[PDB]
Design a protein around this ligand. Structure first.
Ligand SMILES: Cc1cc2nc3c(=O)[nH]c(=O)nc-3n(C[C@H](O)[C@H](O)[C@H](O)COP(=O)(O)O)c2cc1C
Ligand SMILES: Cc1cc2nc3c(=O)[nH]c(=O)nc-3n(C[C@H](O)[C@H](O)[C@H](O)COP(=O)(O)O)c2cc1C
Lengths: 187, 186
């Protein structure tokens, strides 16, 4: 099969599905977020991609903090709703049970399986988006999501996202041991 | 029940599974990469998070270019191999069939399902990792991975990753229409 040139506007296959929390004018906001990735190993840093058109960036700029929150699959609707409406027009502070942590100002979602509380280290600006690089200063889960002290993805049952087809997916079958199977081909 | 604090070195659940391609000293190199995200809508830009201890950043730094390649699930072994061995000591240029694009500087993998050829726009440095921001200037797939010229993830069959438990996963079942199912709560 020959290689075909396609539209340059391609998204990652798949994206994760997260809820991004920020205080904006003292009130908790949440937006749906798929543009999240680790950036730095030590200290542990992630980055978050946010359109300049959204309400959320004002809050992240104000507070220098944000959270990354992982819903389970049964929260699909509330999650999607947070990616359909803006905090500019619609109060999203009441949709979830909100808790705060050490940074005081990054609102986190009680119902989410995992919450990463982040301190803005650097705000990167690109033509249509900010990418807020944050240090993970505290991480929260619950015992029922952990195996040997660490998050277990099957317990979490997180969502996945694909655009512009606009689909949600869940995690499928185990597919091998990472940093392991490749050793089979070594030396 | 109650929230409990766990260790701060937390990865995204799950990560994507990608092969990062660069020329180093005129020779193709590939590493496994889960630290990638889109960073700008228009023009299309992604960012890649790369340890300073790796061989690949030397190549991206030389060339001002790199590629992002999506293996399908049957490629797990060679993919993990690329995440274990460094081009510093082990030549990885022959592991896969390599093709180049418009830039002629960023090596892409024929066997992969989707190849993104990227021009570095901005390079950031953090204490242990570079963060290279690239513009997607060319994107390559095959008819067999496409619906109306658009990648279909089930045809692609890409790998997912979780760490530090170090598990690969594939994609599961359709779970709803994004930017749609949530319309009910309005
Ligand atoms: C599943 C999903 C993922 C999304 N991911 C992002 C993203 O990564 N970055 C972004 O800027 N917008 C993203 N959006 C769109 C925003 O969440 C949406 O416009 C939201 O209403 C912004 O909220 P706000 O105005 O209160 O900040 C996503 C939407 C959906 C439904
Ligand atoms: C599946 C998996 C994902 C990985 N993701 C990243 C990553 O996102 N960033 C990074 O710096 N290293 C990552 N690594 C580690 C590098 O891929 C690995 O150290 C590789 O051997 C580097 O090779 P190089 O020295 O030729 O660049 C990953 C490893 C595995 C197996």
């Amino acid at each position: 099969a020959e290689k075909i040139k396609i539209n340059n506007n391609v998204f990652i296959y798949p994206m994760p599905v997260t809820l991004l929390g920020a205080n904006v004018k003292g009130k908790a906001n949440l937006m749906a977020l798929g543009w999240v990735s680790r950036v730095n190993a030590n200290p542990p840093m992630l980055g978050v991609g946010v359109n300049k058109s959204h309400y959320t960036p004002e809050g992240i700029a104000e507070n220098g903090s944000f959270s990354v929150n992982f819903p389970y699959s049964g929260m699909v609707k509330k999650t999607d709703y947070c990616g359909l409406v803006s905090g500019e027009k619609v109060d999203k502070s009441g949709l979830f049970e909100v808790f705060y942590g050490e940074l005081k100002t990054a609102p986190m979602i009680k119902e989410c399986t995992l919450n990463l509380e982040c301190r803005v280290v650097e705000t990167l600006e690109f033509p249509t988006n900010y990418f807020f690089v944050g240090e993970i200063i505290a991480a929260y889960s619950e015992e029922q999501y952990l195996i040997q002290g660490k998050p277990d993805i099957k317990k979490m049952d997180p969502l996945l996202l694909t655009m512009p087809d606009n689909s949600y997916w869940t995690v499928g079958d185990y597919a091998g041991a990472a940093l392991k199977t490749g050793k089979s081909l070594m030396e």
